[PDB]
Design an enzyme around this catalytic site. Structure first.
Site, short mmCIF file in Angstrom:
data_model
loop_
_atom_site.label_atom_id
_atom_site.label_comp_id
_atom_site.label_asym_id
_atom_site.label_seq_id
_atom_site.Cartn_x
_atom_site.Cartn_y
_atom_site.Cartn_z
N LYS B 77 18.25 4.50 -11.19
CA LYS B 77 18.30 4.58 -9.74
C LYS B 77 18.16 3.18 -9.17
CE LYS B 77 15.20 6.42 -6.71
NZ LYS B 77 14.44 7.58 -6.17
N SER B 210 5.95 3.14 6.61
CA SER B 210 6.48 1.80 6.40
C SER B 210 5.49 0.72 6.83
CB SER B 210 7.81 1.65 7.15
OG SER B 210 7.66 2.01 8.51
N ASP B 236 6.14 0.18 -1.66
CA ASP B 236 7.29 -0.70 -1.57
C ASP B 236 6.91 -2.08 -2.11
OD1 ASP B 236 6.27 -2.03 1.22
OD2 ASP B 236 6.37 0.13 1.55
N1 LIG Z 1 6.23 7.40 -3.78
C1 LIG Z 1 7.55 7.61 -3.86
O1 LIG Z 1 8.09 8.21 -4.79
C2 LIG Z 1 8.39 7.17 -2.71
C3 LIG Z 1 9.71 7.61 -2.58
C4 LIG Z 1 10.43 7.23 -1.45
C5 LIG Z 1 9.83 6.39 -0.52
N2 LIG Z 1 8.57 5.96 -0.70
C6 LIG Z 1 7.92 5.10 0.29
O2 LIG Z 1 7.42 5.90 1.36
C7 LIG Z 1 7.35 5.10 2.55
C8 LIG Z 1 8.02 5.82 3.72
O3 LIG Z 1 9.43 5.92 3.49
P1 LIG Z 1 10.37 6.73 4.52
O4 LIG Z 1 11.71 6.96 3.85
O5 LIG Z 1 9.62 7.89 5.10
O6 LIG Z 1 10.52 5.59 5.66
P2 LIG Z 1 10.85 5.89 7.22
O7 LIG Z 1 11.10 4.53 7.82
O8 LIG Z 1 11.81 7.02 7.36
O9 LIG Z 1 9.43 6.42 7.77
C9 LIG Z 1 8.30 5.55 7.78
C10 LIG Z 1 7.52 5.88 9.04
O10 LIG Z 1 6.24 5.25 8.99
C11 LIG Z 1 5.90 4.88 10.33
N3 LIG Z 1 4.78 3.93 10.28
C12 LIG Z 1 4.83 2.60 10.03
N4 LIG Z 1 3.59 2.09 10.06
C13 LIG Z 1 2.73 3.08 10.32
C14 LIG Z 1 1.27 3.22 10.49
N5 LIG Z 1 0.44 2.16 10.39
N6 LIG Z 1 0.78 4.45 10.76
C15 LIG Z 1 1.58 5.52 10.88
N7 LIG Z 1 2.92 5.48 10.75
C16 LIG Z 1 3.53 4.30 10.47
C17 LIG Z 1 7.21 4.38 10.92
O11 LIG Z 1 7.22 4.45 12.35
C18 LIG Z 1 8.20 5.36 10.32
O12 LIG Z 1 8.44 6.47 11.21
C19 LIG Z 1 8.03 3.78 2.20
O13 LIG Z 1 6.97 2.91 1.81
C20 LIG Z 1 8.86 4.12 0.98
O14 LIG Z 1 9.15 2.98 0.18
C21 LIG Z 1 7.83 6.34 -1.74
#
Ligand SMILES: NC(=O)c1ccc[n+]([C@@H]2O[C@H](COP(=O)([O-])OP(=O)(O)OC[C@H]3O[C@@H](n4cnc5c(N)ncnc54)[C@H](O)[C@@H]3O)[C@@H](O)[C@H]2O)c1
Ligand SMILES: NC(=O)c1ccc[n+]([C@@H]2O[C@H](COP(=O)([O-])OP(=O)(O)OC[C@H]3O[C@@H](n4cnc5c(N)ncnc54)[C@H](O)[C@@H]3O)[C@@H](O)[C@H]2O)c1
Ligand code: NA
Ligand code: NA
Lengths: 344, 344
Positions: B77, B210, B236
């Site tokens: 991936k 994020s 991330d």
């Molecule tokens: N663990 C895993 O397997 C896995 C898989 C995919 C993504 N992720 C990670 O999950 C995270 C979220 O990804 P996503 O696709 O939902 O992104 P996204 O941008 O769709 O959503 C992230 C949200 O977090 C909000 N945000 C930012 N700072 C914040 C804070 N201090 N408090 C509350 N909300 C806040 C943003 O406004 C946004 O709406 C990223 O770090 C991504 O890399 C992890």
């Protein structure tokens, strides 16, 4: 936004329209300038590649190779080394693909074959190094290993040196006997010769074998010409080498990628303090190569992702000019960026 | 031999034909079995993912994640985290693709979107962990971050727990306002609630933000319920965390991938000596997790390539049954395996 896919057909049409010679020359020239840019500190060597070893049907490896151009794009080549492929499946030992990702959004923007591109830039890299380190009147090329890479080793080197003949050896009689026909277009006459004769008579040699780990050397430690230049091109598993330690210890050794070569190249055999300046430095400042044409030299080639990014750019320029390839919506881009299920 | 490509339209048709609940349940079931197989030594954790940090327009990362099923196939991936994508480009923050290679030959056999697949298996993994570590009568889910991942966090957890209520927060008012519409298909009543209320009221929480490096925590270290289970899902850049250290130090902590979590998970905050058994071991032997349902627990989630391979299998099975996708000849297989110029 859709991914630009260059099928095998589109890659074939690029080389057919441009011609093998001109396409190889374009990639040689691009690699030369790009290596010089690295040598001047305008660009950076790619990070070390990674890989997964595979034991069956014979030991091979599958590797990934990223290179980032910050603010522009990221190149990833994925490539397998599976040396039973030709005899067992009629597939090339080296099977790969090259992808490009937008550095700003992460989107997959382009995808193409990596089989042809790999052979082209690997020949081109040897040509860049041999222009610096082989005698410019080199007449006789030696090849140990006459499989796929041997074809573009001979082709690229024939464009930068006045080669008149190639003395060639392979441990598979069928593979050495078929090389003359694959080489015919170059106009370089091919003669089968045992490795000791190749060592004695060649002005430049490329080794590009699927020799197993611990089963080198493929060229014997014997008399060579004073000015011999060797492109050591075979590379796959940790522990795989091709040249005799005694020859290497007498040689001026330049690696395409020092840290990678110490792990996977002939430099596995050497103390790290005995490496010469890497190829990129020779390209930017030829002082380090001055006089080395007339003594024993080894270009330790492992390949690195910057070379694939550069060769990919040559292909994409040609393909863009000709409107080649297809557009495939592969990535799901939901109408609502926050809704994975908005399958718009 | 041609590559089977599932485009955005084929992935959408899989969801439409199979149904969201059934598709998610299939991926939950595959993940639980696969993790148990790792916990029993029948399969092995994927290698460490690699990545390239990007600074513009905001800090993000682009990562590659390989996984090998020996003798069968290799999954890779490639996935970007670009948190300015929604506001700046109308693109998802997480943009990726999943490729499958034949392990015997190295040939690229399949390629598909990774955007939806990523959201599905990430929700599924939280559901697997929360089934083990959350009270089975958990009624209230807390969500910090209501972007793309929150949607499948809620969906997957609603399939394994008797959720009646989701208390949700996002720092972007438009993102928390729209979450209820994106969540409507689950039937779970969504309420907006500030982080301290979520910490005080939730039976289970997922954090999936994020948030920038060093800008945590996203949940305050205040009164939590004794039995709280947290899925720490945001991951991330190195340095990015979401939970308060004091909460983490009181919790039973299980990582999906210990070495990844020490680099990119909440376990960055913890000594290496402090972690419990990883999730795979809890799936194989749930007796080690049952006793932690009623005390504070954290599932430290980074995501690893095995999950992508398992989820890809679910999609390929469903796509094959429905004759979905296209076949594209991407790799060059020369008619002569030893001749890169033998364009078939
Ligand atoms: N663990 C895993 O397997 C896995 C898989 C995919 C993504 N992720 C990670 O999950 C995270 C979220 O990804 P996503 O696709 O939902 O992104 P996204 O941008 O769709 O959503 C992230 C949200 O977090 C909000 N945000 C930012 N700072 C914040 C804070 N201090 N408090 C509350 N909300 C806040 C943003 O406004 C946004 O709406 C990223 O770090 C991504 O890399 C992890
Ligand atoms: N340096 C680079 O950038 C780069 C790029 C691509 C491939 N390679 C490497 O080059 C090597 C050859 O690749 P290929 O595509 O030509 O494979 P190939 O299978 O087409 O050819 C290898 C040939 O070497 C022969 N051989 C095996 N052992 C030998 C020995 N002891 N002496 C002489 N010949 C022997 C085989 O019979 C075969 O004909 C591999 O190690 C590959 O991984 C390097
Ligand atoms: Na080498
Ligand atoms: Na995490």
């Amino acid at each position: 936004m859709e991914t630009w896919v260059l099928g095998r057909r589109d890659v074939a049409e690029v080389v057919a329209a441009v011609g093998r010679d001109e396409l190889m020359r374009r990639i040689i020239d691009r690699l030369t300038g790009g290596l010089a840019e690295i040598g001047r500190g305008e660009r950076h060597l790619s990070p070390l590649r990674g890989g997964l070893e595979r034991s069956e049907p014979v030991p091979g490896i599958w590797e990934w190779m990223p290179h980032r151009e910050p603010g522009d794009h990221i190149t990833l080549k994925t490539v397998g080394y599976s040396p039973a492929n030709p005899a067992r499946f009629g597939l090339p030992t080296i099977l790969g693909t090259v992808a490009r990702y937008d550095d700003t959004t992460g989107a997959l923007t382009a995808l193409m074959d990596g089989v042809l591109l790999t052979a082209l830039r690997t020949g081109a890299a040897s040509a860049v190094a041999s222009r610096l380190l082989a005698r410019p009147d080199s007449h006789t090329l030696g090849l140990i290993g006459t499989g796929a890479q041997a074809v573009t080793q001979l082709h690229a080197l024939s464009l930068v040196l006045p080669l008149q003949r190639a003395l060639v050896w392979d441990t598979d009689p069928a593979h050495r006997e078929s090389f003359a026909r694959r080489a015919a277009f170059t106009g370089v006459s091919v003669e089968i010769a045992e490795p000791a004769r190749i060592a004695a008579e060649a002005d430049v040699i490329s080794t590009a074998t699927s020799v197993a780990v611990g089963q080198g050397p493929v060229l014997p430690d014997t008399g060579v010409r004073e000015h011999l230049h060797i492109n050591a091109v075979g590379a796959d598993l940790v522990g795989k080498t091709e040249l005799p330690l005694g020859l290497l210890e007498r040689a001026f050794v330049t690696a395409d990628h020092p840290e990678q070569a110490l792990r996977e190249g002939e430099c596995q055999q050497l103390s790290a303090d005995r490496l010469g300046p890497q190829l990129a430095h020779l390209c930017a400042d030829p002082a380090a190569a001055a006089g080395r044409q007339d003594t024993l030299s080894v270009f330790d080639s492992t390949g690195f992702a910057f070379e694939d990014a550069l060769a990919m750019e040559v292909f994409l320029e040609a393909a863009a000019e000709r409107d080649l390839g297809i557009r495939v919506g592969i990535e799901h881009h939901p109408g609502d960026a926050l809704d994975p299920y908005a399958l718009q």
